Amino acid sequence: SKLKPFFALVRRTNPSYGKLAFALALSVVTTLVSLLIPLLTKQLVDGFSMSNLSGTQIGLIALVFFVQAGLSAYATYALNYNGQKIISGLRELLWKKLIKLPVSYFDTNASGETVSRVTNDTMVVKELITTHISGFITGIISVIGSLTILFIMNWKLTLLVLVVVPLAALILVPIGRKMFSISRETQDETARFTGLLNQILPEIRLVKASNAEDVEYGRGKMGISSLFKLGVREAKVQSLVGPLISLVLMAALVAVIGYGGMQVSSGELTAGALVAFILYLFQIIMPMGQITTFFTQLQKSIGATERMIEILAEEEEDTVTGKQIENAHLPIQLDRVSFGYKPDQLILKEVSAVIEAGKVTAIVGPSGGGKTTLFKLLERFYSPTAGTIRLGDEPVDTYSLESWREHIGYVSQESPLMSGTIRENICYGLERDVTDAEIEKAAEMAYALNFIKELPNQFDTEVGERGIMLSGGQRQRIAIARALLRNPSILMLDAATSSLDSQSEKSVQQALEVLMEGRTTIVIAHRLSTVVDADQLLFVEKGEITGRGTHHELMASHGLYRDFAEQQLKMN
Amino acid sequence: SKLKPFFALVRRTNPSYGKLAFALALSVVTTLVSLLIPLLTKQLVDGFSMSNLSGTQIGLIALVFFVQAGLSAYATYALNYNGQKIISGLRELLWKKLIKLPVSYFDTNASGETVSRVTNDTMVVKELITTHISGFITGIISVIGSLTILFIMNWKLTLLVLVVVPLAALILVPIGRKMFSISRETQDETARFTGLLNQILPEIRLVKASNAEDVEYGRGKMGISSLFKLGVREAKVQSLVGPLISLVLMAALVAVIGYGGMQVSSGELTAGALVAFILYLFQIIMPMGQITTFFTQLQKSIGATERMIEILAEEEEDTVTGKQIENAHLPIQLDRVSFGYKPDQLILKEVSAVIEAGKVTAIVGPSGGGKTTLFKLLERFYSPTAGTIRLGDEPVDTYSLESWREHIGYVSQESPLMSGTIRENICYGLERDVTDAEIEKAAEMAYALNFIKELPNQFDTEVGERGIMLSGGQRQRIAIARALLRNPSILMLDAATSSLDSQSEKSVQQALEVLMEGRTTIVIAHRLSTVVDADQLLFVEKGEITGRGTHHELMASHGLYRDFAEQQLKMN
Ligand SMILES: CCOc1ccc(-c2nc3ccc(-c4nc5ccc(N6CCN(C)CC6)cc5[nH]4)cc3[nH]2)cc1
Ligand SMILES: CCOc1ccc(-c2nc3ccc(-c4nc5ccc(N6CCN(C)CC6)cc5[nH]4)cc3[nH]2)cc1
């Protein structure tokens, strides 16, 4: 019943079932031919009584070897190609799901663990499909057929000792596990010793200042003693593990082969059956390891597939709400907004506010308050539950969130870079308009073309995957240029202004304020450099908005103590 | 020639060569017995025509098996025990050298890599001593003896094809290396794809805000398409490999064993000696891996022993200079002090200053100047080259450096913890005076016992190996108490101030100042309280001392001169 999710997930890829089944059957046929090769060898050994049939049998054996090799090659190619196709389909589905998934999932669950899980589990499912299931089938067939053929050919005597010998496994396995436990304990002790040394060494200045180095040496000696004692123990235990194992193996070996040799001398039904027996043992041994590896890999892959389905079970909506955007130019209202991330916690409580259209607005939050939550709420990445973020009559729930997003410009603190060139990084918002060649001209409108006039190149200017040769000063100018290029209708900022100092700050701020003067603006940062240019100021504390009006003149009557205390912490 | 350093290093630990040589000889004897065993098996197989001799030979074989097991067990125990003793000696020598190595070496070269080259190279040398040398000797003996015995047993026919077949290594090994190369290329591609995804995902806020889900999905699809192409190429290359490896190995096995059985059946002498031949094949194939592993580990160990000797090559001293300390109370003067880390750079140039005795002196330095160099120079951690830090009418080495350090208390920025209990913290000053039982009293006047008045425990007060349950203020207070306990004669601080806050800062400053009440004090911090807490002031700039006199005059003049820039940095 646990394989049903795996079958459904593989079905999601629309596999070529016929080709996979044909490849598996061809692998079975190859295993059956490898089950036949030793019989031909036995026939050759028995037929050495004359020389021409020896040559004919050698030719037949070579032909069977080549046929087996070719059949196995084609089966492996079909298996691997189908596995790669299934993995490509699975990765396509997973990446389509991840990108469309709401930003809440990324913030509240993980960022790199998701990509890790995706890649690792796709690789595990590939290993289960292309190798381990066929490997298990081939191993089962090989073991069963070899045991049956040994029973038919060399009969009870030798095969019974062959399957009584695995009592040697009941002596090897506990011994091997004791070796593993002692090795793990020694490794842990070594880790403790190196941790002690790595703790002591950085404070060597303090050690020598106190002139207690000898004492530390003594401490070190104790560690070197401890390991030694444990090491000695390992030695003793290894002296009961190293030889004994070999002994048992050799004993088993001799026994088996010895009986074969004996049955050759006594005249029993064994002339070339001994050679066939050794070849069948060699075909027996490896499939045991293959089966064990398959069992462990299935134990891992069931959980991997469960994680796959857990990723593929989420949902998100982009245009489902509706499509009725026409102007997107109206005062925005927060009405009874009270919701955070989980309804139980209630990180937001009864937040209400008004913002006019075409006026710069500020959102000042404390260090650890609800400024980030309020930003994400206004930025429409969080689904409203109780309150209403309205544009009048609350149309935001009846038209596409993508229509909202196309009309919003956003750069908050860094927005570092999107892997590519400058033209693509300012062309990230091609809403099917292609934007012609306005881009660089708009950069001149954003005072960016004259800033990039040095021009290492235009289209080949590579920021690299790392993105480190450009400081934060140049990238934020590019971000502002892109924001004004896409759709200057409503713009929101965490005031990407930084340590750039007035020289760059003056230019970037004057450009921004002159361009988006006629359109709605929101600022959410802490600095007061933007609040003087913000027509309306709002303050947030304890998940509640307190303060409406012009500016610092009005917080002088409302936040003259609490807001002043946070600003005092800021002056530090 | 290259083994001489290894032999010398082993000799440094008194190897007790007799036991090691006896263990090696016993291993050789065990290998000879293992070579003997298949001949006894062949005797039993040939003699299996009547039952009693079969039982006698089985008993003899079992006795030889047990003798071999016991001899191998004792040889392994002796080898491992001698190796552990050698490693303990080497670790003791290395740790003594490390703890006695100069501080200047530690900061300029490495911190954790030094511990790595005491923990990992010792393990490598152990692997070479206990296992790989004996393993190589026993493998060479086994291979040569088995080839010789097979030559005297089957002569031209079987053993020539025996040797000729593993020339199929010239067919297998290139194929395996091509497999490894293709696997490495695929792994690199998947690593690049994982990096691309881990770069895309954290920018999901910008990705959705700009509404480029389709673009990012397309880029991910291109990445997984490249991965699919790599997988298809790997699939083809593996399909032209796996069946080839199986075919070559099975053709080898069939040729050898079928020829053996063919000789057995024909009448050509082989009787039941095919059993001995198979056992000799099993004793031949195993030690090849041991020989190859020995060669690779010999390369690694001959690389690591040089690092061992280089660590052990360096030297340092603490009392060779002399022993001429009687008072250690005299004004401190700098006389044309010019030395840094390397004579070529000359980071210090003719630094000179006058410091009285019992007068607190403050040092002011810039962010990246030479304040740290002079700070470490005053502690005598760096060897004078040209200039002289004269204390004692010029001779500063007439007395032992340990004696100079003994009269010194030191805590600069953190001085985090010496892991264990507060007993170690207060007893690090146990310079043969044991302090009787006055440590708690010493804590009492030093204003530490009332700080620990909550008393979780007195002697069992534990801080943990990590040392995170106490704050910076408390550990700095304990450091001050230790400094006042050892020898409150001459003191230098960097005024460790991290999280004490005004109350604790003033408390520790007043207690510390009361405690010396007439002993020399040195301060090198940047805080203005620390610099007003000093009768005489200094200033460091460009590796030169510029400024002498009283606090107010210097602070007013230096700020007038150029120190106002550093001050402006301070208010920031
Ligand atoms: C399914 C049942 O059938 C079986 C078929 C084969 C084996 C079997 N597979 C083996 C693989 C390796 C060894 C083996 N590896 C060895 C390594 C070293 C030595 N030495 C060399 C030197 N030392 C000191 C003494 C012996 C013997 C060794 N014998 C024995 C083995 N016996 C067991 C059961
Ligand atoms: C000359 C010195 O003497 C030698 C004697 C033996 C070997 C030798 N050592 C071997 C170890 C493993 C294998 C082997 N590994 C296999 C893996 C798979 C299969 N299969 C299982 C299913 N497939 C499809 C068919 C056969 C057979 C296999 N046979 C062959 C081997 N031949 C080498 C030199």
Residue numbers in the entry:
A (entry chain A), B (entry chain B): 10 to 581
Original paper wording:
The Bacillus subtilis efflux pump BmrA, belongs to the type-IV family of MDR ABC transporters, conferring resistance to cervimycin-C secreted by the biotope competitor Streptomyces tendæ13. Type IV ABC transporters involved in MultiDrug Resistance (MDR) phenotype perform their function by undergoing a series of conformational changes pertaining to the alternating access mechanism. They are formed of two transmembrane domains (TMD) forming a cavity at their center where substrates bind, and of two nucleotide-binding domains (NBD) binding and hydrolyzing ATP-Mg2+ to fuel the system. Binding of ATP-Mg2+ to the NBDs bring them together, translating this conformational change to the TMDs which then open towards the outside (Outward-Facing, OF) where substrates are released. Importantly, the E504A catalytic mutant that still binds ATP but cannot hydrolyze it20 was used in this study; this thus allowed to probe a unidirectional transition from IF to OF states, BmrA being blocked when reaching the OF conformation when complexed with ATP-Mg2+ 9,12,14.
Interestingly, all ligands induce a cooperative ATP-Mg2+ binding like R6G, with a similar K0.5 (56.0 µM ± 2.6 h = 2.0 ± 0.3 for Hœchst33342; 65.5 µM ± 3.6 h = 2.3 ± 0.3 for Doxorubicin), suggesting a similar influence of ligands on ATP-Mg2+ binding, albeit the varying hill slope between ligands suggests that a ligand-specific effect might occur. Here again, E504AH33342 is 100% in the IF conformation. The high-resolution reconstruction differs slightly from E504Aapo, with a reorientation of the second half of the transporter induced by Hœchst-binding, leading to a further separation of the trans-membrane helices and a re-orientation of the second NBD. These modifications match the ones induced by R6G binding, with E504AH33342 structure being very similar to E504AR6G-25µMATP. Two molecules of Hœchst33342 bind per BmrA dimer, in a similar location as the one occupied by R6G. Ligand-binding on BmrA was similar within the drug-binding pocket, but extruding more within the TM helices for Hœchst33342, its structure being longer than R6G. Hœchst33342 also induces a reduction in the conformational space exploration of the NBDs, confirming the observations made on R6G, and showing a further decrease in amplitude compared to R6G.
